[PDB]
Design a protein around this ligand. Sequence first.
Ligand SMILES: COc1ccc(S(=O)(=O)N(CC(C)C)C[C@@H](O)[C@H](Cc2ccccc2)NC(=O)O[C@H]2C[C@@H](C)O[C@H]2[C@@H]2CCCO2)cc1
Ligand SMILES: [Cl-]
Ligand SMILES: [Cl-]
Ligand SMILES: [Cl-]
Ligand SMILES: [Cl-]
Ligand code: NA
Ligand code: NA
Lengths: 99, 99
Amino acid sequence: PQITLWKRPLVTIKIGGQLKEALLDTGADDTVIEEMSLPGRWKPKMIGGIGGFIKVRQYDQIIIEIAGHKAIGTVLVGPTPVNIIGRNLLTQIGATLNF
Amino acid sequence: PQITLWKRPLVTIKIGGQLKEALLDTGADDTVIEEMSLPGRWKPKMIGGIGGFIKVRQYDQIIIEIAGHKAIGTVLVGPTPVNIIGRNLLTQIGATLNF
Ligand SMILES: COc1ccc(S(=O)(=O)N(CC(C)C)C[C@@H](O)[C@H](Cc2ccccc2)NC(=O)O[C@H]2C[C@@H](C)O[C@H]2[C@@H]2CCCO2)cc1
Ligand SMILES: [Cl-]
Ligand SMILES: [Cl-]
Ligand SMILES: [Cl-]
Ligand SMILES: [Cl-]
Ligand code: NA
Ligand code: NA
């Protein structure tokens, strides 16, 4: 698809058996999901941006379905104000910025 | 251009005759630049990032070139870590997300 940017680029994702809405975010290095349980090992991480840093749990090798496209990678879980699909997973679905 | 996301989508911008680096950010509603001098009056704005809210200065109708494309629109100035081109200016340069 072609997604214009008049509004936030929100899509449906499936992660950990749950449907969520998430923002396709080219400015995010990382994928960050609101609090939820995921299987397997995790380790703590700090991520920062506007307003400072938050602590998250880092889960590696997590499968997400993003607008119908399956990907696998690291997913961070913590008190993000919105679910964010960052570049680590946008690359895997072949997303590009065009102008 | 078609910009892939394996690296950060950094471009050169020109604002007030100055070249700067900035991030093309589909997750940003607005454009936010590091402290600099802009002409005219400013209005107050609070923006919310990963870490919380910050105060910025909102300057309207500012001339800005983004990767060679002309834009004229709102620029927020404040303590952002990186210069961010958000959707208010990405729409002016015709940017879309594609996969
Ligand atoms: C209203 O206009 C706004 C409001 C907010 C922002 S923003 O906070 O920058 N933000 C909104 C988003 C968190 C929902 C845009 C993000 O793309 C934002 C842009 C940015 C900010 C500061 C330094 C570098 C890059 N990315 C961002 O915060 O990314 C961090 C969080 C996590 C997802 O990944 C992190 C890493 C390190 C920084 C880059 O990627 C921009 C404009
Ligand atoms: Cl919107
Ligand atoms: Cl990854
Ligand atoms: Cl590619
Ligand atoms: Cl905001
Ligand atoms: Na894992
Ligand atoms: Na102005």
